[PDB]
């Protein structure tokens, strides 16, 4: 099995959204302290009709049907996700509701958990099954699913929906470059679900956003060696067209790329000119743990990163932007992004990809794009994903109502035995969507479609 | 990459245990319905100094340590389990302590999660991981962790616990037949766990052992099919020298032994003489769910199994019977018994392991055993392991004990802020062993050694 990755993505995010600008107004934030403090526009949410559930029979029946994939063909199948709503029974064994109507029982492949980072093992574990001896000569099935949603305070913001399908094979367009890649892995306590009754996580940000550096910098600098063992130079910010990162809000991916650039300098590399060395050394007196805190460090970093960042960065926000953190699906709608706006230009091209996880799980690693027939297409992805169409089919949310709903799905959490309202949701979402109908007294679910 | 598996094995249990026939006295229960009915001679509990992650890092350590393998050498690293204690923060992050110390933080994987299937899960992700494009030359570690515990009624007489860990690697002396293999998926409520903050299960039995059986004919049939292929002939119960099984309680395991005999039936197979013939073929009108049903046939076919069961299953059952449900780790105790008895009759041999988590994920695997170096031979394994000396290390409860300290764990799972309190159960543990000292207002975890 040769040039194993990805071929065929597709993704689904509920259409009930509300608009930053508006809940700036909502909470008393500063004016822009979401849309350019946080770098967000817009954040998608489940209602009660809607889960990781729903949203992942959505995704796959999706991917199935349009990219005209017979669902006997698929001989493995992998969830990524951080959202449980049973600690024994995975969501991988409700995705066999939709297995079960053409008797494809022989399919491997159960939950992957950790944190915003799942979906990556996921996809790393379907890869190696393509290329292992006991793979039968089926595709593999990836899917991303989670559901973003803070307490009231100031992380509630940062909030997103999302599932995203991958399926997985050989003579791709988006091929893994087998070595090149890094992880670093840690036990930390920056951002946790302890509270086993709660939707909502713990969280520090003294760590949070300080670990998500640590770690990135420790799969840079493992990529880095691997690169110069197999293409005989130093990796800099120069050697791949493309970075895509875990997307928890906007305002992160400025910083994360600015400090590939920092890092950059550390290593004397060919990508930091005369200028960049004068401005930059003012700071190599840092403690390690200094870098990692110095606010004057991040401003410089970000300013001499900003047109990099348009060439490199800039393309694979979209979708970030407009719809929030995606957890396990934030990276690969990022991805989705990048192949959206720029695949026209993307055969032959290097994209490197960064997923992270707090408790701190991260791989840094690497893809070659290329071209390849239809309907395992850069063009074809970029047609059936359909994201213009599907960021048109939204419907706003005044902050109020939000609010209301975040209180409801407060009591749905955990519970059981309800039937589901329909009045005023079911009529706005897309035709053929899966919804939750009713959790009956044994906290057994019941979806319904269209 | 050649003759990948398992390389060398541990195991953990805590040595705190109470007997069935004491615990069929103290509830009321008539005697011998938990060492007949049952099959079981004894419950091993984790007391509050005992969780899945302190019995992890005893299996690992161990492992380590006494088989002189050194941690850098670990580069993939991943856990089973169905116990949460985090609903993001994976057990994997926890074990990462252990390798912070030699500076190796570029190890891949994290936590699988579907019921008493989840480490067989990571142990085939393990495999094609070696096998892969991407395998940096390193072993790859999988460590199986649980903690069986049930409310009040007739379920509780079923718990156990254990952590157990295997090191994977090329030139192996358990070696994966890559094809020989079926696996069942399907979407069923016959055991699951949707109470949050509860540390028990929501059991069915009317599904429970129908869906263990529906998915055991339905993997057996698809090895069938595999072995057909390859080998030109039909499988039966003859053509391996060991059927091992997931051991959720002893009497199972002889009805899923009974099971494989009468799908011989079904089909014909070498296995099934004139006799037995005549003996099942009163039933032959049944439906398919009238079989999953009929209490007649189920004594008819453990009654023709007895010598088979002897000779291929009996030596399976030390430990299950011993210690009790090991969830994810059940199936791989078994295999340690096997290994424990039999291994100087085990080269050359075939094994065929069967492995199943509720919600319903399933596989049925074959194995080849052989003859190899120390330290990675079937004997060392078998000395390493010290089954004997573990099970002779233990200490009594009185049923009543048990009780209070099952009310004690009721308050501890999920809370925060407290200190475990050690007088005279500290002084019951190995020299060595890692225990839960205490959990702080954050609920954070804090591990002590000796
Ligand atoms: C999810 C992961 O995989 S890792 C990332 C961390 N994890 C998460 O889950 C994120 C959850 N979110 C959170 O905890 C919070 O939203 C935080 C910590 C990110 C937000 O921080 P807060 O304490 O709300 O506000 P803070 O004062 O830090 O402001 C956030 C940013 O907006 C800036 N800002 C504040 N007001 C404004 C404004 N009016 N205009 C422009 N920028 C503003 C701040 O200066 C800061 O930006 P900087 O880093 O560019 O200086
Ligand atoms: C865990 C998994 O991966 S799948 C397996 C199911 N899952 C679990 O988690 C097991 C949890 N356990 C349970 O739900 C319960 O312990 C059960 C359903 C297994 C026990 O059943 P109960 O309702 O307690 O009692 P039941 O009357 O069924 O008796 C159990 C067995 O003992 C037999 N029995 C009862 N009393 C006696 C006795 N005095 N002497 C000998 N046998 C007896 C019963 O006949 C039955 O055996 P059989 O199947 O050989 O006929």
């Not at 399908?165 to 090149?180: C, N, Q």
Request: charge should be neutral; charged fraction near 25%; aromatic fraction near 12%.
């Amino acid at each position: 099995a040769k040039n194993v990755g990805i071929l065929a993505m597709d993704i689904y995010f509920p259409p009930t959204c509300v608009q930053q600008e508006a809940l700036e107004a909502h909470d008393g934030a500063s004016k822009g302290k979401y849309t350019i403090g946080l770098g967000q526009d817009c954040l998608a949410f489940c209602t009660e009709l809607e889960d990781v559930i729903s949203m992942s029979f959505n995704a796959v029946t999706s991917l199935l049907e349009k990219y005209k994939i017979d669902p006997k063909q698929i001989g493995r199948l992998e969830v990524g996700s951080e959202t449980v709503i049973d600690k024994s029974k995975s969501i991988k064994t409700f995705l066999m509701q939709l297995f079960e109507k053409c008797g494809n029982t022989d399919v491997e492949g159960v939950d992957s958990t950790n944190a915003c980072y799942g979906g990556t093992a996921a996809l790393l574990n379907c890869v190696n099954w393509v290329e292992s001896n006991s793979w039968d000569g089926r595709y593999g099935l990836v899917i991303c699913t989670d559901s973003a949603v803070y307490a009231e305070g100031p992380a509630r913001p940062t909030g997103g929906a999302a599932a995203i399908a991958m399926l997985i094979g050989p003579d791709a367009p988006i091929v893994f470059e087998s070595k090149l890649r890094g992880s670093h892995m840690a036990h930390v306590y920056d951002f946790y679900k302890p509270n086993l009754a709660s939707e909502y996580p713990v969280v520090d940000g003294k760590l949070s956003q300080t670990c998500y550096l640590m770690a990135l910098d420790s799969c840079y600098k493992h990529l880095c060696n691997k690169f110069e063992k197999l293409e005989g130079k130093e990796f800099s910010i120069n050697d791949a067209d493309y970075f895509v990162f875990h997307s928890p809000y906007n305002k992160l991916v400025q910083k994360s790329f600015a400090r590939l650039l920092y890092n950059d300098f550390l290593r004397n590399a060919s990508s930091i000119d005369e200028a960049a060395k004068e401005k930059f050394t003012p700071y190599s007196s840092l403690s390690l743990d200094e870098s990692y805190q110095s606010r004057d460090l991040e401003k410089v970093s970000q300013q001499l990163a900003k047109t990099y960042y348009d060439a490199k960065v800039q393309p694979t926000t979209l979708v970030p932007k407009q719809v929030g953190n995606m957890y396990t699906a934030s990276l690969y709608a990022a991805f989705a992004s990048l192949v959206h706006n720029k695949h026209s230009d993307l055969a032959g091209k290097r994209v490197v990809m960064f997923s992270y996880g707090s408790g701190s799980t991260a791989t840094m690693f690497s893809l070659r794009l290329c071209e390849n027939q239809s309907p395992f297409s850069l063009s074809n992805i970029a047609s059936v994903m359909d994201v213009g169409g599907k960021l048109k089919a939204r419907h706003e949310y005044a902050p109020e109502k939000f609010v209301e709903t975040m209180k409801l799905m407060e009591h749905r959490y955990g519970a059981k035995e309800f039937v589901t309202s329909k009045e005023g949701i079911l009529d706005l979402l897309a035709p053929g969507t899966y919804y939750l109908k009713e959790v009956d007294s044994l906290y057994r679910r019941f979806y319904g479609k269209k």
